[PDB]
Scaffold this active site. Structure first.
Site, PDB file in Angstrom:
ATOM      1  N   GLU A  35      30.377  48.741  23.138  1.00 35.86           N
ATOM      2  CA  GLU A  35      30.414  48.269  21.745  1.00 35.86           C
ATOM      3  C   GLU A  35      31.862  48.306  21.222  1.00 35.86           C
ATOM      4  O   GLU A  35      32.338  47.355  20.583  1.00 35.86           O
ATOM      5  CB  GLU A  35      29.548  49.181  20.861  1.00 35.86           C
ATOM      6  N   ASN A  46      30.530  39.263  12.450  1.00 35.32           N
ATOM      7  CA  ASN A  46      29.360  38.571  12.998  1.00 35.32           C
ATOM      8  C   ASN A  46      29.205  37.209  12.324  1.00 35.32           C
ATOM      9  O   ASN A  46      29.704  36.967  11.206  1.00 35.32           O
ATOM     10  CB  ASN A  46      28.095  39.404  12.761  1.00 35.32           C
ATOM     11  N   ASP A  48      26.693  35.925  10.780  1.00 28.84           N
ATOM     12  CA  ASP A  48      26.051  35.979   9.477  1.00 28.84           C
ATOM     13  C   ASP A  48      26.933  36.450   8.334  1.00 28.84           C
ATOM     14  O   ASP A  48      26.474  36.555   7.208  1.00 28.84           O
ATOM     15  CB  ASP A  48      24.752  36.786   9.512  1.00 28.84           C
ATOM     16  N   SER A  50      28.331  39.455   8.158  1.00 25.76           N
ATOM     17  CA  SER A  50      28.450  40.903   8.179  1.00 25.76           C
ATOM     18  C   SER A  50      29.552  41.254   9.183  1.00 25.76           C
ATOM     19  O   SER A  50      30.078  40.379   9.853  1.00 25.76           O
ATOM     20  CB  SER A  50      27.136  41.550   8.595  1.00 25.76           C
ATOM     21  N   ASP A  52      30.716  44.588  12.077  1.00 23.34           N
ATOM     22  CA  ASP A  52      30.329  45.805  12.789  1.00 23.34           C
ATOM     23  C   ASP A  52      31.555  46.748  12.789  1.00 23.34           C
ATOM     24  O   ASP A  52      32.674  46.317  13.040  1.00 23.34           O
ATOM     25  CB  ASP A  52      29.975  45.473  14.253  1.00 23.34           C
ATOM     26  N   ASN A  59      26.598  47.953  11.682  1.00 22.01           N
ATOM     27  CA  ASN A  59      26.601  46.719  10.904  1.00 22.01           C
ATOM     28  C   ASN A  59      26.559  46.849   9.371  1.00 22.01           C
ATOM     29  O   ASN A  59      25.806  47.674   8.840  1.00 22.01           O
ATOM     30  CB  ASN A  59      25.500  45.804  11.472  1.00 22.01           C
TER      31      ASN A  59
HETATM   32  N1  LIG Z   1      34.268  47.106  26.274  1.00 20.60           N
HETATM   33  C1  LIG Z   1      34.888  46.543  25.028  1.00 20.60           C
HETATM   34  C2  LIG Z   1      36.145  45.816  25.102  1.00 20.60           C
HETATM   35  C3  LIG Z   1      36.755  45.314  23.913  1.00 20.60           C
HETATM   36  C4  LIG Z   1      36.117  45.545  22.659  1.00 20.60           C
HETATM   37 AS1  LIG Z   1      36.930  44.899  21.009  1.00 20.60          AS
HETATM   38  O1  LIG Z   1      37.269  46.179  19.887  1.00 20.60           O
HETATM   39  O2  LIG Z   1      38.369  44.051  21.427  1.00 20.60           O
HETATM   40  O3  LIG Z   1      35.779  43.815  20.290  1.00 20.60           O
HETATM   41  C5  LIG Z   1      34.878  46.239  22.590  1.00 20.60           C
HETATM   42  C6  LIG Z   1      34.259  46.728  23.759  1.00 20.60           C
END
Ligand SMILES: Nc1ccc([As](=O)(O)O)cc1
Ligand SMILES: Nc1ccc([As](=O)(O)O)cc1
Ligand SMILES: Nc1ccc([As](=O)(O)O)cc1
Ligand code: NA
EC number: 3.2.1.17
Length: 129
Positions: A35, A46, A48, A50, A52, A59
């Protein structure tokens, strides 16, 4: 804060996520990896409207108030920015509410697609907990 794997496992255990609602610790570490990449500051918008937030990408449509998700509930009664802290307390408390909600960890898309049904104990291998 970008947590180390075992460092996050220890923090989540200390906060009582291990086996919470029957979900072993590796489930929560795996979810956090996919995540947020273990980064408390992570935010992702997202479709919609919102967004995260945090280590467990909580969310703003249902759980926290970010001031810009018109038509939203703030069921964890917290500003979304509180979920970006290096201190994961707020994220953990809110996650306990979410996972109790009805669909369990299926609420987390990354958990369902990348952790569920896998050998999640691997996520805590080598840790001293
Ligand atoms: N494994 C993983 C890699 C990148 C991200 As992101 O904070 O760049 O959306 C989130 C999860
Ligand atoms: N217009 C409007 C904008 C934001 C919010 As809210 O995400 O702080 O609940 C509610 C209404
Ligand atoms: N086969 C098997 C599946 C899940 C687990 As466990 O992550 O709940 O400890 C242990 C063994
Ligand atoms: Na909200």
């Amino acid at each position: 804060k970008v947590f180390g794997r075992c460092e996050l496992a220890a923090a989540m255990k200390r906060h009582g996520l291990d086996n919470y609602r029957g979900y072993s610790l590796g489930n929560w570490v795996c979810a956090a990896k996919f995540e947020s990449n273990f980064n408390t500051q992570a935010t992702n918008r997202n479709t919609d409207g919102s967004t995260d937030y945090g280590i467990l990408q909580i969310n703003s449509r249902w759980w926290c108030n970010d001031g810009r998700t018109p038509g939203s509930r703030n069921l964890c009664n917290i500003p979304c920015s509180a979920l970006l802290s290096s201190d994961i307390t707020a994220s953990v408390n809110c996650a306990k509410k979410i996972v109790s909600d009805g669909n369990g960890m299926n609420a987390w898309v990354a958990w369902r697609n990348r952790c569920k049904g896998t050998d999640v104990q691997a996520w805590i291998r080598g840790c001293r907990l």
